Protein backbone atom coordinates (compact mmCIF):
# COMPACT_ATOMS: atom_id res chain seq x y z
CA UNK A 1 0.00 0.00 0.00
CA UNK A 2 3.22 1.89 -0.21
CA UNK A 3 3.05 0.21 -3.66
CA UNK A 4 0.31 2.40 -5.07
CA UNK A 5 0.19 5.89 -3.55
CA UNK A 6 3.92 6.02 -3.26
CA UNK A 7 5.03 9.64 -3.05
CA UNK A 8 1.62 11.08 -2.18
CA UNK A 9 -0.28 9.93 0.83
CA UNK A 10 -3.53 8.05 1.76
CA UNK B 1 31.73 -7.38 13.11
CA UNK B 2 28.46 -6.28 14.76
CA UNK B 3 25.29 -6.05 12.64
CA UNK B 4 22.25 -3.89 13.46
CA UNK B 5 19.00 -5.13 11.88
CA UNK B 6 16.55 -2.24 11.47
CA UNK B 7 13.10 -1.89 9.93
CA UNK B 8 11.75 1.39 8.55
CA UNK B 9 7.94 1.47 8.78
CA UNK B 10 5.30 4.16 8.33
CA UNK B 11 2.41 5.21 6.13
CA UNK B 12 2.89 5.69 2.41
CA UNK B 13 4.19 9.05 1.28
CA UNK B 14 5.94 9.68 4.58
CA UNK B 15 9.45 9.09 3.18
CA UNK B 16 10.66 5.66 4.32
CA UNK B 17 12.57 5.09 1.07
CA UNK B 18 14.07 8.60 0.83
CA UNK B 19 15.35 8.45 4.43
CA UNK B 20 17.02 5.05 3.84
CA UNK B 21 18.66 5.98 0.52
CA UNK B 22 19.84 9.39 1.72
CA UNK B 23 21.38 7.50 4.63
CA UNK B 24 22.94 4.63 2.64
CA UNK B 25 23.79 6.53 -0.57
CA UNK B 26 23.70 10.20 0.59
CA UNK B 27 21.30 11.49 -2.08
CA UNK B 28 17.63 12.44 -2.23
CA UNK B 29 15.60 10.38 -4.73
CA UNK B 30 12.80 12.34 -6.37
CA UNK B 31 10.67 9.24 -6.97
CA UNK B 32 11.22 5.70 -5.76
CA UNK B 33 8.79 3.01 -6.93
CA UNK B 34 5.87 2.78 -4.50
CA UNK B 35 5.97 -1.03 -4.83
CA UNK B 36 9.55 -1.68 -3.81
CA UNK B 37 10.52 -3.32 -0.56
CA UNK B 38 14.28 -3.77 -0.42
CA UNK B 39 16.99 -4.18 2.20
CA UNK B 40 20.05 -1.92 2.33
CA UNK B 41 23.48 -2.57 3.82
CA UNK B 42 26.41 -0.26 4.61
CA UNK B 43 29.41 -0.16 6.98
CA UNK B 44 29.30 2.95 9.19
CA UNK B 45 30.83 4.24 12.42
CA UNK B 46 28.51 5.08 15.33
CA UNK B 47 30.09 6.50 18.51
CA UNK B 48 33.47 5.27 17.31
CA UNK B 49 32.26 1.74 16.58
CA UNK B 50 32.60 0.34 13.05
CA UNK B 51 29.46 -1.74 12.42
CA UNK B 52 27.17 -2.88 9.57
CA UNK B 53 23.63 -1.57 9.20
CA UNK B 54 21.16 -3.99 7.59
CA UNK B 55 17.98 -1.99 6.97
CA UNK B 56 14.65 -3.16 5.53
CA UNK B 57 12.70 -0.38 3.82
CA UNK B 58 9.17 -1.82 4.00
CA UNK B 59 6.44 -1.58 1.37
CA UNK B 60 3.47 -2.93 3.34
CA UNK B 61 2.02 -5.12 0.59
CA UNK B 62 0.14 -8.39 0.75
CA UNK B 63 2.25 -10.71 -1.43
CA UNK B 64 4.33 -13.07 0.73
CA UNK B 65 8.01 -12.13 1.18
CA UNK B 66 10.19 -14.61 3.07
CA UNK B 67 12.67 -11.75 3.56
CA UNK B 68 10.09 -9.44 5.15
CA UNK B 69 9.22 -12.17 7.66
CA UNK B 70 12.97 -12.71 8.22
CA UNK B 71 13.27 -8.99 9.11
CA UNK B 72 10.24 -9.12 11.40
CA UNK B 73 11.49 -12.21 13.31
CA UNK B 74 15.08 -11.01 13.72
CA UNK B 75 14.80 -7.23 13.45
CA UNK B 76 16.25 -5.48 16.51
CA UNK B 77 14.99 -1.88 16.15
CA UNK B 78 12.35 0.04 14.23
CA UNK B 79 11.73 3.52 12.84
CA UNK B 80 8.08 4.56 12.99
CA UNK B 81 8.05 7.39 10.48
CA UNK B 82 5.38 9.98 9.61
CA UNK B 83 5.39 13.32 7.80
CA UNK B 84 4.86 16.54 9.74
CA UNK B 85 2.65 17.82 6.88
CA UNK B 86 0.55 14.61 6.88
CA UNK B 87 -1.77 14.44 9.90
CA UNK B 88 -3.16 11.06 8.83
CA UNK B 89 0.35 9.56 8.87
CA UNK B 90 0.77 10.56 12.52
CA UNK B 91 -2.62 8.99 13.32
CA UNK B 92 -1.30 5.81 11.64
CA UNK B 93 1.76 5.54 13.91
CA UNK B 94 -0.01 3.62 16.68
CA UNK B 95 -1.10 0.86 14.29
CA UNK B 96 2.52 0.17 13.34
CA UNK B 97 3.75 0.26 16.94
CA UNK B 98 1.05 -2.26 17.89
CA UNK B 99 2.12 -4.49 14.98
CA UNK B 100 5.74 -4.35 16.18
CA UNK B 101 4.65 -5.19 19.75
CA UNK B 102 2.79 -8.16 18.27
CA UNK B 103 5.86 -9.46 16.39
CA UNK B 104 8.20 -9.32 19.37
CA UNK B 105 5.46 -10.04 21.95
CA UNK B 106 6.95 -7.19 23.95
CA UNK B 107 5.95 -3.64 24.86
CA UNK B 108 9.69 -2.87 25.08
CA UNK B 109 11.07 -2.87 21.51
CA UNK B 110 13.85 -0.34 20.68
CA UNK B 111 12.04 2.17 18.47
CA UNK B 112 12.48 5.69 17.15
CA UNK B 113 9.53 7.96 16.32
CA UNK B 114 10.53 10.08 13.31
CA UNK B 115 8.80 13.10 11.83
CA UNK B 116 10.17 13.36 8.27
CA UNK B 117 10.02 16.41 5.93
CA UNK B 118 11.13 19.00 8.53
CA UNK B 119 12.20 21.15 5.56
CA UNK B 120 8.55 21.92 4.79
CA UNK B 121 6.76 25.02 6.10
CA UNK B 122 3.27 23.48 6.12
CA UNK B 123 3.31 21.70 9.48
CA UNK B 124 0.17 20.10 10.88
CA UNK B 125 1.74 17.72 13.42
CA UNK B 126 3.61 20.01 15.77
CA UNK B 127 6.65 19.12 17.84
CA UNK B 128 4.94 18.97 21.23
CA UNK B 129 2.22 16.71 19.85
CA UNK B 130 4.86 14.34 18.50
CA UNK B 131 6.76 14.70 21.78
CA UNK B 132 3.56 13.74 23.62
CA UNK B 133 3.32 10.57 21.54
CA UNK B 134 6.99 9.59 21.85
CA UNK B 135 6.78 10.19 25.62
CA UNK B 136 3.74 7.91 25.91
CA UNK B 137 5.72 5.17 24.13
CA UNK B 138 8.95 5.72 26.08
CA UNK B 139 11.08 6.25 22.98
CA UNK B 140 13.20 8.96 21.39
CA UNK B 141 11.50 11.30 18.91
CA UNK B 142 13.63 12.73 16.10
CA UNK B 143 12.80 15.33 13.47
CA UNK B 144 14.26 14.59 10.04
CA UNK B 145 14.38 15.81 6.45
CA UNK B 146 15.55 13.24 3.92
CA UNK B 147 15.63 16.16 1.45
CA UNK B 148 18.30 18.25 3.22
CA UNK B 149 19.71 15.27 5.23
CA UNK B 150 18.82 17.00 8.49
CA UNK B 151 18.54 14.50 11.38
CA UNK B 152 18.97 11.54 8.99
CA UNK B 153 22.07 10.16 10.70
CA UNK B 154 20.78 10.83 14.22
CA UNK B 155 17.48 9.01 13.58
CA UNK B 156 19.15 5.74 12.55
CA UNK B 157 22.06 6.08 14.99
CA UNK B 158 19.73 6.77 17.92
CA UNK B 159 17.97 3.55 16.94
CA UNK B 160 21.27 1.66 17.06
CA UNK B 161 21.86 3.23 20.48
CA UNK B 162 18.45 2.04 21.71
CA UNK B 163 19.44 -1.42 20.42
CA UNK B 164 22.71 -1.52 22.36
CA UNK B 165 20.91 -0.58 25.60
CA UNK B 166 18.32 -3.32 25.14
CA UNK B 167 21.17 -5.78 24.43
CA UNK B 168 22.46 -5.73 28.07
N1 LIG C 1 9.78 17.81 1.08
C1 LIG C 1 10.27 16.57 1.30
N2 LIG C 1 10.02 15.61 0.38
C2 LIG C 1 10.50 14.35 0.59
C3 LIG C 1 11.30 14.05 1.78
N3 LIG C 1 11.67 12.77 1.74
C4 LIG C 1 11.15 12.25 0.62
N4 LIG C 1 10.50 13.20 -0.07
C5 LIG C 1 9.79 12.94 -1.30
O1 LIG C 1 8.72 12.15 -0.76
C6 LIG C 1 8.21 11.33 -1.79
C7 LIG C 1 7.75 9.93 -1.32
O2 LIG C 1 8.56 9.30 -0.33
P1 LIG C 1 9.30 7.90 -0.68
O3 LIG C 1 10.79 8.11 -0.83
O4 LIG C 1 8.81 7.32 -1.98
O5 LIG C 1 9.00 7.07 0.65
P2 LIG C 1 7.63 6.28 0.97
O6 LIG C 1 6.61 7.19 1.63
O7 LIG C 1 8.12 5.19 1.87
O8 LIG C 1 7.01 5.84 -0.32
C8 LIG C 1 9.25 11.43 -2.90
O9 LIG C 1 8.80 12.49 -3.75
C9 LIG C 1 10.48 11.95 -2.21
O10 LIG C 1 11.45 12.56 -3.08
C10 LIG C 1 11.51 15.14 2.71
O11 LIG C 1 12.17 14.90 3.73
N5 LIG C 1 10.98 16.33 2.42
MG1 LIG D 1 9.25 2.46 1.39
Author numbering:
A (entry chain D): 65 to 74
B (entry chain A): 1 to 168
Paper text:
Finally, we successfully obtained the crystal of KRAS G12V-H-REV107 peptide (65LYDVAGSDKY74) complex and determined it at 2.3 Å resolution by the molecular replacement method using the coordinates of our KRAS G12V structure. The H-REV107 peptide was bound to one molecule per four molecules of the KRAS G12V with a solvent content of 47% per asymmetric unit. This structure comprises residues 1–168 of KRAS, 4 MgGDP, and 83 water molecules with an H-REV107 of 10-mer peptide. Notably, the H-REV107 peptide was strongly docking in close proximity to the switch I and II binding pockets and the near P-loop of KRAS G12V. The hydroxyl group of the H-REV107 peptide Y66 strongly bound to S17, D33, and A59 via hydrogen bonds, and interacted with the phosphate binding P-loop, and switch I and II regions. Charged H-REV107 peptide D67 also interacted with P34 and T35 in the switch I region, while charged H-REV107 peptide K73 interacted strongly with KRAS N85. Notably, the catalytic domain of KRAS around G12V on the P-loop region was surrounded by the H-REV107 peptide in the wide binding pocket, and D67 of the H-REV107 peptide penetrated deeply into the hole between the switch I and II pockets. In the H-REV107 peptide complex, the switch I region including P34 and T35 and the switch II region including Q61 were more open when compared to the form in the KRAS G12V MgGDP. The structure of the KRAS G12V-H-REV107 peptide was found to be an opened conformation with an inactive GDP-bound state, and large conformational changes were shown at the regions of switch I (T35) and switch II loops (aa 60–74). As indicated by the structures of the KRAS G12V and H-REV107 peptide complex, the binding of H-REV107 peptide moves the switch I and II regions even further away and interferes with GTP binding itself.
The small GTPase RAS proteins operate as “molecular switches” that fluctuate between inactive and active states. These switches can be activated by the exchange of guanosine triphosphate (GTP) for guanosine diphosphate (GDP), which is promoted by guanine nucleotide exchange factors (GEFs). The H-REV107 gene is a known member of the class II tumor suppressor gene family that has been identified as a growth inhibitory RAS target capable of suppressing anchorage independent growth in vitro an in vivo. Here, we found direct interaction and inhibition between KRAS G12V and novel H-REV107 peptide.
